[PDB]
Structures are given as structure tokens and as C-alpha cells.
Amino acid sequence: QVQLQQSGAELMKPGASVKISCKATGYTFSSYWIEWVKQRPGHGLEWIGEILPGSGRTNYDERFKGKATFTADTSSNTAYMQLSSLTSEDSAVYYCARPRIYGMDYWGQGTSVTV
Amino acid sequence: QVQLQQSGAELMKPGASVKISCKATGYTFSSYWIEWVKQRPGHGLEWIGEILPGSGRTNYDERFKGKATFTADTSSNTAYMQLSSLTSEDSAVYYCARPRIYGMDYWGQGTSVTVS
Amino acid sequence: IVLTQSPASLAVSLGQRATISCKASQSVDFDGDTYMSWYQQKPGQPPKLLIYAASKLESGIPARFSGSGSGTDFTLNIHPVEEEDAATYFCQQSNEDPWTFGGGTKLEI
Amino acid sequence: IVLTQSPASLAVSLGQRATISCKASQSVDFDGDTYMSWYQQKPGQPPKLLIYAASKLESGIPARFSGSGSGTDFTLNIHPVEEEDAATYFCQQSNEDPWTFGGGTKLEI
Amino acid sequence: CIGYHANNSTDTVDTVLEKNVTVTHSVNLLEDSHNGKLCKLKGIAPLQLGKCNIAGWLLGNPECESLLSARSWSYIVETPNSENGTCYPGDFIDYEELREQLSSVSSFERFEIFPKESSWPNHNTTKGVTAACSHAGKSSFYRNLLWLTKKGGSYPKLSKSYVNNKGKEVLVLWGVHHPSTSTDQQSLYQNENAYVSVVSSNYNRRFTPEIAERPKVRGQAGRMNYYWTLLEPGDTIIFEATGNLIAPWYAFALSRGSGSGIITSNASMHECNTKCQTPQGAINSSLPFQNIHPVTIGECPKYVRSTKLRMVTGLRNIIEGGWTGMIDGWYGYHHQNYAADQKSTQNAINGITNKVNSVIEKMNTQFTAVGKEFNNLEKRMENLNKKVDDGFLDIWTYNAELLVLLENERTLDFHDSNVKNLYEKVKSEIGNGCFEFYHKCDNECMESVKNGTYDYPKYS
Amino acid sequence: ICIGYHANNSTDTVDTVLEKNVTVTHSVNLLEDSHNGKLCKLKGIAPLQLGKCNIAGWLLGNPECESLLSARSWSYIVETPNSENGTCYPGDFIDYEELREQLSSVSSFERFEIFPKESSWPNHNTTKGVTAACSHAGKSSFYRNLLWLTKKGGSYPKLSKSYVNNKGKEVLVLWGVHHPSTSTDQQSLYQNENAYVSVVSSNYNRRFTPEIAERPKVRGQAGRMNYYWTLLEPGDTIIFEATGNLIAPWYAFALSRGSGSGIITSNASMHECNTKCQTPQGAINSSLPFQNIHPVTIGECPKYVRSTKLRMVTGLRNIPSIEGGWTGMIDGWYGYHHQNEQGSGYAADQKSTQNAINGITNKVNSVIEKMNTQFTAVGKEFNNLEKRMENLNKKVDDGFLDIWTYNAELLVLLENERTLDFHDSNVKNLYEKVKSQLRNNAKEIGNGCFEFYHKCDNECMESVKNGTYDYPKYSEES
Amino acid sequence: ICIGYHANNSTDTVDTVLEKNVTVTHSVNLLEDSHNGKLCKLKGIAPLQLGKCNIAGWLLGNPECESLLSARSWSYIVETPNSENGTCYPGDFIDYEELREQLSSVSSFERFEIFPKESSWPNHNTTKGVTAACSHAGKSSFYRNLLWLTKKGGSYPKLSKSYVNNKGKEVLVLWGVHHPSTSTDQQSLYQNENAYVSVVSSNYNRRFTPEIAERPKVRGQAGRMNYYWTLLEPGDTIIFEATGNLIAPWYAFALSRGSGSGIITSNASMHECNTKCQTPQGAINSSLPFQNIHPVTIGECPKYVRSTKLRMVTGLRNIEGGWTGMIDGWYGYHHQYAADQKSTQNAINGITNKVNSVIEKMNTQFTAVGKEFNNLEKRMENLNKKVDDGFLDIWTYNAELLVLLENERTLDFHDSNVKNLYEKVKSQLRNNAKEIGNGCFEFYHKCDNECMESVKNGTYDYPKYSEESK
Ligand SMILES: *[C@@H]1O[C@H](CO)[C@@H](O[C@@H]2O[C@H](CO)[C@@H](O[C@@H]3O[C@H](CO)[C@@H](O)[C@H](O[C@H]4O[C@H](CO)[C@@H](O)[C@H](O)[C@@H]4O)[C@@H]3O)[C@H](O)[C@H]2NC(C)=O)[C@H](O)[C@H]1NC(C)=O
Ligand SMILES: *[C@@H]1O[C@H](CO)[C@@H](O[C@@H]2O[C@H](CO)[C@@H](O[C@@H]3O[C@H](CO)[C@@H](O)[C@H](O)[C@@H]3O)[C@H](O)[C@H]2NC(C)=O)[C@H](O)[C@H]1NC(C)=O
Ligand SMILES: *[C@@H]1O[C@H](CO)[C@@H](O[C@@H]2O[C@H](CO)[C@@H](O)[C@H](O)[C@H]2NC(C)=O)[C@H](O)[C@H]1NC(C)=O
Ligand SMILES: *[C@@H]1O[C@H](CO)[C@@H](O)[C@H](O)[C@H]1NC(C)=O
Ligand SMILES: *[C@@H]1O[C@H](CO)[C@@H](O)[C@H](O)[C@H]1NC(C)=O
Ligand SMILES: *[C@@H]1O[C@H](CO)[C@@H](O)[C@H](O)[C@H]1NC(C)=O
Ligand SMILES: *[C@@H]1O[C@H](CO)[C@@H](O)[C@H](O)[C@H]1NC(C)=O
Ligand SMILES: *[C@@H]1O[C@H](CO)[C@@H](O)[C@H](O)[C@H]1NC(C)=O
């Protein structure tokens, strides 16, 4: 059907820029959005933003704007994330999800960016 | 020229049965209803029911249910009303009348039934 | 339905207006049409329809026989009376299915 | 907009219902249609939605999961309760732009 | 001798060069005879509305109780004297479109969409009866509609849904009653600010009563506008009204067809089994033209305004003249020592018999061309339809007249050309048509010359 | 004797299937090409010249078109293309095109005071119903057929007026509804804001509600007036009741239904004539079957075809302007040069010539009868939401026009070919009769001409012509 | 000197009114029945492919037709039978088929922001007007050309927004009116209960009010949106006055009128080619007068006739008798087989005149694109279908009858022209030749092959070749 594959877990020095790749297979990549959400330990999941591949539109959350920068590559059928100036506060597991009208579905694998 | 003939005078002991005859002339018998109305001295005029000739559909006043049963013979242009188990309380004069929207314009001569 | 009438007996001299009041328990005018009839009955004869719709005069009935009223108030006015007008008068409603009649009133000379 | 789940933690017995409620600062109903989704996240696994539009179960789900409520108030009850579904539950709203998730709640046998 | 046949027939034809010509044979192509008699088509009896129209039949007029059992028919017939329709004054909204839809249907089934006793518990169904819709002595109302008044002084907002599980289109009819006084509105439907909302999945209209003082029609100062809509299979229609709702008692499950139609006729109905049916009377004919009536049902000849369409099959009945003596063949071989025939011209005769088939088949038959009805606000479209019908009728009349005239001229030129060709073949002499022979030619010699192969130099 | 076919000096050109155009002797131009260019009377009735007014302004009685108030009867209705003055107060004439179609049929009417101004409305202020948009003689005026009612002293009682059509003819009643720009203007004109106009009849039932909103200015007015109409049947009653915003009718027209009338949009002038046909370009009169002047016609008119040239062939082909005709021998259609020692004159074969001419006249009469004198077929205007119906009507008109153009042209070509071959066959059979009169007694010039071995005089040769001469009379082989 | 006619091995058979299926030497087929299925560009301008969307979806700006909002000009509009995206929110497009007819004659438009979203409605709300019925990419969205205005912070002030048509062309303005399913929904979107929408122009005037009622679900919504439109003349003002329920215009279309365009429903593929005729089944590059491919056409196209065969008899019949010896011209004489050039050239010129006249008679059918009607216009639809079918029968019959008449005329022309050649040849010399009886008259005196020249050119002298037969 539809599968979402993320990059493996990775740790990086504070104050640097980390790239997270989300692999979408089984459907037209540009057809649906890609919602980026991070789940801090002991906190509810926070909606980072969302990027449509073909159009390039990126709707950043006010809280997480500037901290993250979404990019997508239609040829590779993936959409990346650009987190700069990492911190243990910023550290959490990150998810790319294919949204439906009332909520995201097919979710993803998940990736930790522990700092 | 429309006329509604009725039977003569009849008498029976209480508990008998009578087939009151009404004969309609000058118009399509099944076209108009034939209303049945009871008149007794000191009580005025009381509506017994109605029967649509040919169709077979009929209505009865609630107080006359079972007491009165209507049948029609569209071949002879004759409408018949039946009273079963006559009692001394049901002695009156009965009319067959052709209704119009607001009231009955054409009536019959009327027949009176006694209980002795 | 219940349909009362008044007066029970009417004593009107010749050449005098005679008014007979018929009252109804329930309104007998549906959709602006009054289902009310006025009859006269010689003794031993079937009633004859005089006023239908509570105001319209029947064909073959002279202009002396006139009535009016609507709702629950109905009156039949006879003027001038004659020796032939002495009869029992009936008001009948056709709005309800029981098609109930009035009590009947005796008018003398 | 903010979502609040009550209770934060709850203990359940097998076969007995567990009611989970979500509260919102603003009503998540626009033009009759209500946007609220219920997710369950087994530890080490992605959250999985249970109900979309707060009442409609998605394909391939047990009937024990149920969604109810509208406007500000929403509830989630599973009857009965199995040993498998001991995971954290989330209510998410899709009405406003930030698409805020609920705080989450712990379901323990 | 060589000539052409002349019989005693007197059938006349017209051509461009001269008219009123006389030939030995003809084949009329215009059928101007009608049975004058309504007969069933394809074994299916029609539906005779009789004293009613389509509005009265569908609404359930009290004088159309003979039509409540109608299920199937081949074509609807309404007499010109059909005035039992819409007994309560008011206008059928999109009545002519309803007739257009009804022309397509071949059969339906009348069913209780909302059963009267079960559907309306909070509304009062017995009260509504009017003197305008009077059946027999008593007053009555439409059989397919239900007039709901307030029950016990209250008219709570009704909300009745129907899901079209019939598997076919369902023709739902209702009405909105517009009283004459505010007192009447309050006395029938206690809410003065009443409304009727009928919303399907593709129909959405909201109606509001309009109380006004109007001239009395049929003794009534009120009005009842009737509406209709078609419910697609597996669809829901919702009736929501706070007053003035004439609810649908019965609906119709329309089974669509083709070739049927509505004709206004006076012909009485009897038993036949035809293929064509004009209002003047059912006809059949293999001829490809009829002047009986433009409005036809089923397989019918084309309609032209002409009065005589006669092909020419025979030669000029009235150089050699007509051979009255020989009736054996279109062509003769008179013998001095009776006229005979030749096999070389039967093929030409068969070609002409094929030609008449060709001209009749080139006139494709006309199918159901029932007329359309328009209201007083559609005089532009009515005149456009009239212009279209009259233009096509004139064009086909002109085409038929051209075809007969040019064909008669061409075939008369044929009847001359083949005769001249036969003269040449006989040659291969008296110019009147006979062949004088210097040599002695016995009857065997005459037959040999008729074979066309004679040794003229043999005599020398 | 030489026998052939006549040739003429005439240079008229016809068309046939053979050639694109060829020279003949005689022809009849079935396509009329001349129009007088002046509007004229049609069967003794001068038309209605609306001048600058259109139908809407004339019916409403717009202040400019005051001359049309007196008009009663007309053969047809003429509105110049530059005529633009109607509905001076901005608004929408509802079902205006249907009204024009209805007025096409009427042959006359009678303008009468359906509701007299001085009697019908005592409780309303009829004095001030004028506006600057309907300005006349440099003053604020209004329509002469409608009355603008207004509150009387700060009060607008519920109006109720009934008219019973006792004229014996259907009566066209026109009224209007006013939609003020602002609610304060509605209150200033009519007492109550929740006003309504209810016009009912036995066949008409419609309730109007004013709609107040700010609007772009048209002719200086930010309000709108909607004008309506109805056709009251004889003996019927129409009831006008209105709590406000009623432009009450003042004059109604008892329509006398007619036939053969119509509305044209000519721009030609008017002059006294009496013609059986009329086109917007000008009055025409002709017995020819076809005319290309204009599709819109009034009365019995020829057919309309786009064809530029169209004429039957009533003249045999002539080589000078059986090879060739005879140019100077105009005596008859089918002539013979009779040569003799007594004289070498020429005479025409009378019987063949008369047969040919009567046959050709029969053919052209058949052609003229086949066509039907086109009844009044005027155009119809359509709304801006009726482009489907407008295009359907346009397609119908174009298709019928094209079909009749093709039919006329094909008939011309076919009849021309048939009559040419008919003349040729007539010459052939005339020569056949000539050589059947005598055989082997005369040598052959050819080309329909004969010369005799034996000398046969002019009276002898005349007896030969009728076929009363026999070959064995002369036995001169050489 | 045997005089006959040329024959060839051609299988071309034709029909005549007298008899059918007659073989001829040469024929010209006037019915073009072939087409390349690809939708080629008409006059070098590519069409507009609506794809998955109808006219309503394309103009309203349906979320799934985002590739069509870059359209500027086209030759014709192609909506596939699978074009079902239009009006995602359930409701009625008022006068939709009228809009289709208006769009047929439009050659191009310039879609522009009539009321910019960020500066037109400051005291209203523009963001939360999204639906699940118009979802795009798995998220709630709305039309790209309309803006659903809702109350701004619990208030919905009366709005009065005006536009002046300074574009120099008629401007197509589209808006909508929302009818919420329940009164609480109306209150929650537009706080005013008795809301209304007023749209007034110099030519246009209409007021709308919401109608709240319980309705069956369509596409998941129990509410309804009604869509309207109006054509704004140049230099005209349109004023919107709404208290609520207004789906305000966002993008309008400045219409540039054209001629010859049209809307067709095709199942074909867009491929780079140029054509001067384009039926839904495929393009047409042909000069034939009549085509049977499809009635609906764009550009200059042959007339459509329901017939399947239309052949003119250019060449004479083939089987006196047919002789293949003469090959130069149609008609010739057998000399010991020399084809002529005078009579055959005259006949060829005449027959070319015949055929070109037939082509000349039938004007090429212009853009006959069909029209659409709703379920309350069965009468207008049936009248249009009757008109179309009547014209189709009339033109099919005219074409067939003219073909039959011209076939008989041409066969008569040739079969009489051979006789005319025989007649003039026998008219050159009399009694000097003996007719055997098969169309060959040969002299009683033998000639050399050069003696035939005196008969070929025409100049013959009987006395110089006069002898005794016996
Ligand atoms: C089915 O059709 C039948 C007829 O085929 C129809 O019966 C008709 O009913 C009408 C309506 O009542 C009758 O018309 C009236 O007739 C009476 C009696 O003659 C007249 O008094 C009436 O005149 C009044 O109205 C006139 C204006 O129209 C006034 O000028 C006059 O002064 C009166 O005020 C009116 O003409 C009609 O006579 C009968 N016809 C027959 C043959 O009975 C029946 O009602 C229809 N059924 C349904 C259910 O619709
Ligand atoms: C009778 O016809 C004449 C001419 O058609 C009408 O006069 C026209 O009146 C209108 C409105 O009063 C004028 O329009 C105005 O034009 C000016 C510019 O000149 C513009 O600034 C205004 O805003 C307005 O649009 C129009 O020019 C004028 N035309 C002429 C030739 O005078 C007259 O109103 C008609 N009267 C009736 C009763 O119908
Ligand atoms: C109302 O009617 C009056 C007369 O019936 C119209 O005439 C005005 O009357 C007032 C008071 O009598 C005077 O002061 C004015 O001078 C009169 N003339 C004008 C032009 O106002 C009055 O115009 C009518 N008003 C309306 C609104 O219809
Ligand atoms: C031909 O005969 C018919 C019928 O008798 C007649 O109507 C017509 O006038 C005749 N035609 C001529 C030219 O006499
Ligand atoms: C309905 O109305 C009638 C009046 O005709 C009344 O007699 C009856 O009681 C009412 N209620 C029901 C349930 O029929
Ligand atoms: C059909 O035509 C035949 C032949 O004339 C005739 O016998 C038959 O009666 C016709 N059909 C009917 C139903 O009369
Ligand atoms: C495309 O649609 C037409 C419409 O009927 C159909 O005839 C044709 O078969 C379709 N083409 C394909 C490949 O299915
Ligand atoms: C049409 O076909 C002809 C065939 O020779 C070709 O010359 C011409 O270029 C073609 N035109 C188009 C537009 O395809």
C-alpha cells in the first residue's frame, strides 16, 4: 500500500544542521502533503509544519519556524527536514505523516535526533 | 326530474329484520351517494350513514354500527338499507336522500317502522 | 359535532319578520366556505333545502327565505310570512362527517 | 487552540470500559462537520489513529473503539478492554491551522 | 410491328412538363385513409384520460377514479373536452415539462410513498376536504395528495423523509396551499409564518404561503400551487413544512420507455393491433407518405401536406400509339402472318419496381412526433417550435413533390428511350412503327427477326 | 428547305449544371432585386412609427414618445435602430421579449383609463410621481400610462383595486414595483418598510417585495423599477393590492388580436404607397418566387435566398450573340428557311413553337407554385440569459434559409438542363418529321436542312411541311 | 473504325437511382470517413483540456484543477467524459448551461484577482473557510477562485464591496451563497440570523437569502452552496452587499470574445499537430464536402451526413463494348485503338465542373457544437434534438439525391457522348462506309493507315474515295 521510511537514529553536536529524509512509496509523491511532527518525551506531539512536494509550499508552525526548514525532492520521492542549532530541548523523535482531512494516516517509522 | 322512490309502510315485532328499499330515478345511480337519515318525534333528524352505489364503499354513524347495514343494486337503480334485531327504541321514519356538498336537496317519501 | 338551535318554538304574526338562530358547538366554516344548510319540513313530508352555504338561496325558493351568519352564529330570516310558511325548520351542518342536524323549530302564524 | 485529555492516567480492568475525554479551547466543529481524531501509540511505534471526525471508525479496526461528542466535548470509550491496548492515547484536532495534538493519556490494565 | 402497351386504366399523374397525364399503371405513395378508430399498439392498450387531463390524472382528481388502476399503456389519450384537472384553483408549476417527462414513460406503479394513517401522527388528515374537488354529493379531495391541517390547535414542524428504494425514478407530487385571509391561515395551520421546504439530493426549493384577496375561481378565493420532482434511484427526498403542505400520499415509480406519447383525439377506442396511430384514427400502410395528421405514434409514413403522390409505372396510355389489342405485355410484336413480348424488357420493368422501392426507402419513416404544450409565458418558444414543425413539413412536402415530378419525368423518358432502343435492335421501313419487308417473311421468319438475328443479305 | 432553331441578339446569361454561366435568348428573373426603399402602407393602413421610442417606452408611455399615445390601428410596427428611449427610470422590464412577441400578433388596441387618476385612489398622493430620469420639456415627469403612488400625508393605507374586464377583448395591464436605494427613502415615500405588491387574477398570481440596497447610478437614479404585465381575459377580474412600492397602472390596452402583423427594425423613411409585401430595406411588390432583399418580411412576400443571380431558362441557347442558330430570323422560336425557285423566304414552325412555349410556361408556373408565399417571419429579441434559445432560433433560421437557397439553386440548374435538352429534342424530332414527310426524294444538307432532286414549288413544299406529301409523287433519283 | 470507350481494372462500384452497385472506371469519394484520433491544435493554438474537471470546476477553481488556472488562451475546450470534478461543495450552479454557451464563444480570458484576499475584507474572516468536501492533498481546502467569508471574532458586519470594470472587456464575476443545514450552524458562521446577499450592477440585480433546512447528505455535507455569475460590461460597477452567507469573489475572468470555438466532450489524446477541423473522435485534414465521422465539429469542416457512401461517377462505366486498347482519353476509335482527345477532354472538363459544383453547392459546416440543458428543460432539449435530426435527415437526403441525380446525369452524358462521337464521325462521310452493326462502320474501299487521318481530323471527301461496292 503506502509506506513511509525515515532515516535512522542519529546524534549530532549542538549548534549544527541535521537532515532527516522521509521516503514515500506506493503513491504519487506530489499528490499528498507531508506533515512533520516531533514527539518530545513526556510531552504531546507538536506539529512542526507541512510541505507539499510539487508546489513547494511549506506551512511552518510559529513556535517551530526558523528552527526547521522543509525541502523535498520529487525525483528522489523524498522530503527532507533542516533543523539548525540543535539542543537537548530540541531533541526528540520526529515523524513524517501523510495527512487525511481529519488526521494524519500511514504515519512513518520515526527518527531520533538526540543531541 | 330526479326522484327517489321509497317503499311503503312496514311493521314487525322487535327482533326482526327489514330491508328498506330506496329507488332512484333520472340520474346515474352510482354517481351520487344515498344518505340515510332517521327521524323520530321529539328527537329531530339523525344521520344514519351513507352508501356509494356500485363502488360498495359505505359509512355508518357510530351509534348505528351493526344495527344498520347498507347494500346496493346498481342494475335496478335501487338502494337498500337493512336493520337487524329491531327494538322498540328504534321505531322511526327513514329517508333516503341524495346529498349535495352542503346538504341533501332531493329526498324520498319516507318509510315508518313500528315494533308491534 | 353539536348543533343547537333557538328558539324552540316561534310565534310570529302574518307579515312579521321571523328570525331563527342556529348555533354550532364547533366552527363549520373550513377554508372560507360555510357548510350549513336550512330546511323546512311540512308534517308528514321530507324536508326541503332552502338555504345552502348558510347564505345562498335554493332554486325554486322565493326571496323571502333568507339567511346569513358564519362560524358558530347562523340566523334564518323569513319576511313576510304566509300561511304556507308554517313548518318545522332544520339547520344542518356538513363540515363534520356525522353530518348532524339541528333540533328543529316550530313556526306558527 | 489547545486540547486537554482527562484523566491524565487511568487504570482499567479487563472487560470494563475506559472513558477518555478531550477538551478544546475553541469548538472544532465547522459547518457541522467536526474535526477530531483519536490516536493510540504503542511504545516504540508510530501513533495509530482510531476515529476520524470523532465518530467514524477507520477500516480494519476492532469495534471496541468508539468515538462520541461534538463541539468542545469529546469522549473515547473502548468496550471491552483487552491486554494489548495498554498504550498511550491522543486526541488531535484538525480545525485550526496549528493542528495541535492532545496532551495524551496512559491506559493501564 | 413495334409499339407499346395501352390498357384501359385511367389513373392520372402529374409532371413538370405537363400535368394530369394518363399512363397504363401507377402506384400511389400517399396513404390518405384513417380507420377513424383508436386501437392498441403492439398489443398494449392506451390510457384514456377521458374527462381528465394529465394534471387531473396525476394529482388524483376525484372524477378520474377509473385511472387509479392504470399501470401500463402504449400512449396517453386525452379528449379535447377534458376539463377535470386541478379542481382547486392554482397553477401546476412546470406542468408542460411534466407532460414531456410523462410522454417518455411507458408504465409506472402507483404506491403509497407516505401511508396516510402511519406517516402523520401529529397532523390531522381527516379534516381536509373542499367543495371545489367534489366527488358525488359529498365534498372530497385529490386521491394522490393529502391535505394536512393542525391537530388540536398545533401544527408542529413535520419532517418526513423517503428513500427511493424502488430502483426506478419516483415522481413525487405535492402542493402548497395559499389561503385568502390571515384568519384562514391561522385556522388551518396555526403558524402564520409558515413555510414548505422540499430538498432532495438534486432538488432544493423552499415555498412560502402568500395570503391575498383574489377573484374566485370554481367558488374558491384561495390557491394551491402544485409541484413535482423526479427522485433518482437510491435517493432521499425530505419534506419539511411548518404549514400549507399538501403532502404526497401516492407517488409513481416511472419505468421509462420510447415511442410513446400524448395525443389529443376524439376517436373512440376499440380493439385492433396496429403499428401507427394518429389522433384521427389508427392506420397502417406500406406507402411512405400519409397526409392524415402530423401527430403520429409508432412506425408511420412521413407526413406531407400534398393531396396526390403517384409514381409512374406504366407507359403513356394515350409514330406508333398504344396497342389496345395486346394486353399481354408492356411491349408488343405485331405479326402480319398478334403482339408478343420479349425477355429483354422484363429486366427494365424489374428495375423500375426496384426504383419505387428505392424512393420509398430513401424516405425514412417518421417516429413519434407528439406536439409540445407551452404556457402563456412561452409564446416565443411556442412560435419557434411551430416554425420548426412548419418548416420541416414544408421542406418534406417540397421534397416529396420534387421527387415525384422528376421521377415521373425521368421514367417517362425511360418509357420512350427503351421503345426507341427496341426499334433500333429490331432494325439491327415504315416509320410509323411497323417493319415492311421486301422478302417473304413467314411467322418463323418473324420469330427469328424478333430474336434480333436475321440474315438480310440472304434475300438479296 | 433548311430547318433549325432561332437565335437572338440578347446577351442575358443563365446558369446550368454544365457551365458556370452561358448566353441565352430569353429568361425570367425569378429573383427580385429591387426595393423601393421607403416604408409604405400595407393594405391601406399606415404602420406605427415609434420614432425614437421603443416598444417598452411606448407601452409604458415614455414622456418622449407622446405621439404614439393616440395611435389605434397599424399594419405593422417600426422601430428605428437609433431608437433607444424606453424605460426612462432604470430597471428591468420583466418578460419584455414575451411582450414583444405578444404585440407582434395584435392588429390594434384601445388605450383606455383602466384606473382613472382622479377617482381610483383618494387616499394616496398621486400629485408627486415625477422623476428627473423621465424628464420632459425640461421638467421632472413620469410615464403617461403608469401612476406612481405615494403616501398621503405620512400614511400609505393598504391599497386594494379591482378591475373587471368588460371590454370583450383581452386587456394588457402594465404596472411597476419600485425598489428604493435606501430604507430612509422607502420610508419617505411609503409609510411602511415591510411593503409588498400583490397582483392576482384568475390565471395570474404573483407577489412582489421591494428590495432595498445601494446600486450603481443609471441615468442618475440609484433606485430600480421593475415593470410587469398581464393579459386579462374577457370577463376576468384582476386585483391590485399593495402596502407600498406600487407604480399603479393608469392606462390599459384592450388588445384586438390580428394576424400578419409584425415588428421591423427598419431605418428607411415613410411615404404613401399600398404594397402587398414589405421588408425593412423598403416596400417591394413582385410576383417573382424569390427575393434576396431581406429575410424579415411582412405580408405575402417571395422567398428569401442568399443567391445573387437566379433565373429560369426561357430561351434556347444561341450560337450567335444542327450546329448554330439563326441570328436575324426573330419571327419564331422554331423556324425554317424555305428555299425555292419562286422564293427563298423564311417562316417559323408555329405548332412546335407554341407547344414549346406552353410547356415552358407550364414548367415555370409549376416552379412558382411549388414555393409558398412566405408569411410574416420577423426576428425575435432575447434576454441576456437566453443565448441558448437565441442560438437555437438563429440555427433554425440559418438552416431553413440554407435549405431553401440550395433548393432554389438546384431547381434552377435542373430545370435549365431539362429545358435545354427539351429544345434540342424538339429540334431533333422536328427534323425527324421533316425527313419523314419525304424519303429518298431529297438530298441532305444536314443540320436540319434538306434539298430536293426534283423541283417542288413553295405550295408543294408547304404541303410537305404538314406531312400531306408522299415520296412516290416525284421519282427523281438524280 | 470502331468507336467505343476506355475500360480499366478498377473495383470502384457506385450506385444510381435506377439501380445500385454499378462498376465504373473512375469515381471520387466525397465522404471522408478517416481521422487521426489525436486532438491536434486548431490553427496553431493548443486547446484547453479540462481533464478531470467540468466547466464549473474549472471556473470556480476546484482544488483538483490547479493546472487549469494558468490558462490564458485556447482554440477550444475539451472536457473528457470522466470530468466529474466540479462544485465540490454540493449545490446548484444557477444558469450553468448558459455559462457554457457564453464560454463557447470566448477565445481567451485573463484571470485576475478581482478582490485581493489580503486587502478586500479586513473586518471579516478569510482563513477558516475550508471544507472536507473540497479536500486537496488530504487536507481541507476550498475553491481557488472564491473566498468563503465568515464572521471576524463573533461579528459579521454588513459588507459593501464594489468593483469597476476598467479592464476594457466584459468581466465574468462568480460568487456563491451558502445555505447552512441548521440555524446554529448559520449563527456560528455568520452571526446574523436574517442574513442576505445583494449583487447589483447596471444590468444585473438580484438578492439572495439563505434557506436553512434538513437535507440529504451529498459528498458528506448536509448544507448547500448556490453558485451564480454575471457578465460585467466595460466601464461598469458591480456592488456586493452581504450581511452573511456570501462566498465572495476572489478571481474574475476578463473575457476576450472569439469565433469558431466550442466545448466538446472527447476521449482522445493531446498530440502535437495542426488541423483546420477537429471532431471529438479526431482531427480532419480533408477537402471532401461530406464527412460521417461526427456531427460536432470545430473550425471549417465538411458537412455531416449520416450516410456511409457518397461517390460521384467521374469515370464512365466499365465491364458496343469496353475496349482497353485506347488509353489516352476516355473516348476513342479503334484504328488498325487510337484514343481521341477532343470529346474526352470536353467530357472531363464538364465532369470536373459537375463535381466542383456539387462541392460548391454545399457550404462547409461551421462550428456546430452542441448545447446542454438541465432536467427542467426537456422541452427545449427535445426541440433542439428535433432540429438537429431534421437538418441531419434533410442534408443526408439532399446529398444522396444529388449524388444519384449526378450519377445518372454523368452516365447519360458519357453514354450519349460516345454516340455523339460516332454520329459526327459518320457525318463526315456518308455512303462511303458500311456499318457492320456493332458501332464499327468500315469503308467498302480499303484504305492505308494514313487514310484514317482524313476521318480523324474530320475532313473527308467522298468523291475522291467513291467506287463501286458491287
Ligand atoms: C369535472 O368537470 C365537470 C364538467 O365537465 C365539472 O362540473 C362543472 O363545475 C363547474 C364549477 O362549479 C360548473 O360551473 C358553474 O356552474 C354553475 C351551474 O350552472 C353556475 O351557476 C356557475 O356560474 C357561476 O360562476 C360564473 C362565472 O364562472 C358566474 O358568471 C355565475 O353568475 C355564477 O356565479 C358556474 O358556471 C359547471 O357548470 C359544471 N359542469 C357540469 C357539466 O356539471 C366538475 O366540477 C369537475 N370536477 C372536478 C372535481 O373538478
Ligand atoms: C431620450 O433620449 C435622449 C438621447 O438618447 C436621452 O438623453 C440622454 O440622457 C442620458 C441621461 O440623462 C445622458 O447620459 C449622460 O451622459 C453624460 C455625458 O454626456 C454623463 O456624464 C451622465 O452621467 C449620463 O450618463 C445622455 O448623454 C443623453 N443623450 C443625449 C443625446 O442627450 C434622454 O434622457 C431620453 N429621454 C427619455 C425620457 O427617455
Ligand atoms: C403630496 O400632495 C401634495 C398636494 O396634494 C403635493 O403638493 C405639495 O403640497 C405641499 C403641502 O400642501 C406644498 O407645501 C407643496 O408646495 C406642494 N408641491 C410640491 C411640489 O411639493 C406634494 O408634492 C405631494 N407629495 C408627495 C411626496 O407626493
Ligand atoms: C387535373 O385534374 C384535376 C382533377 O380533376 C383538376 O383539379 C385539375 O384542375 C386538372 N388540371 C388541369 C391543368 O386541368
Ligand atoms: C381531525 O380533524 C377532524 C375534523 O374533521 C376531527 O373530527 C378529528 O378528531 C381530528 N383528529 C383526528 C385524529 O382525526
Ligand atoms: C393492417 O393492414 C392490413 C392490410 O390492409 C389490414 O388487413 C389490417 O386490418 C391492418 N391492421 C389492422 C389492425 O386493422
Ligand atoms: C472513449 O469514449 C468513447 C465514448 O463513447 C468510447 O466510444 C471509446 O471506446 C472510449 N475509448 C476507450 C479507449 O475506451
Ligand atoms: C493536410 O494534408 C496535406 C496532404 O498533402 C498536407 O499537404 C497538408 O500540409 C496537411 N495540413 C495539415 C494542417 O495537416
Residue numbers in the entry:
A (entry chain H): 1 to 52, 52A, 53 to 82, 82A, 82B, 82C, 83 to 111
B (entry chain J): 1 to 52, 52A, 53 to 82, 82A, 82B, 82C, 83 to 112
C (entry chain K), D (entry chain L): 2 to 30, 30A, 30B, 30C, 30D, 31 to 106
E (entry chain C): 4 to 321, 337 to 355, 361 to 451, 459 to 490
F (entry chain B): 3 to 323, 337 to 493
G (entry chain A): 3 to 321, 338 to 354, 361 to 494
Please give sentences taken from the publication describing this entry.
The use of computationally optimized broadly reactive antigen (COBRA) hemagglutinin (HA) proteins is a promising vaccine strategy to protect against a wide range of current and future influenza viruses. To elucidate these details, we determined the structures of the COBRA P1 alone and in complex with 1F8.
Using cryo-EM, we solved a 3.1 Å structure of 1F8 bound to P1, revealing 1F8 to be a receptor binding site (RBS) targeting antibody with a unique mode of binding relative to published antibodies. The refined volume consisted of two Fabs bound to a single trimer with well-resolved features between the antibody Fv regions and the HA head domain. This revealed 1F8, a high affinity antibody (see below), to bind a conformational epitope with a buried surface area of ~700 Å2. Examination of the regions of contact demonstrates that the epitope is comprised of the receptor binding site (RBS) and part of the Ca2 antigenic site. Notably, the light chain is the sole contributor to binding the RBS, while the heavy chain forms most of the interactions with the Ca2 antigenic site. This phenylalanine packs with Trp150, while other residues, including Lys130 and Leu191, form the edges of a hydrophobic pocket that facilitates this interaction. Within this boundary, Glu50 in CDRH2 forms a salt bridge with Lys141 to seal the interaction. The rare usage of CDRL1 to form the primary contact with the epitope positions the antibody in a distinct orientation from that of other RBS antibodies, resulting in a previously unobserved, atypical mode of binding.
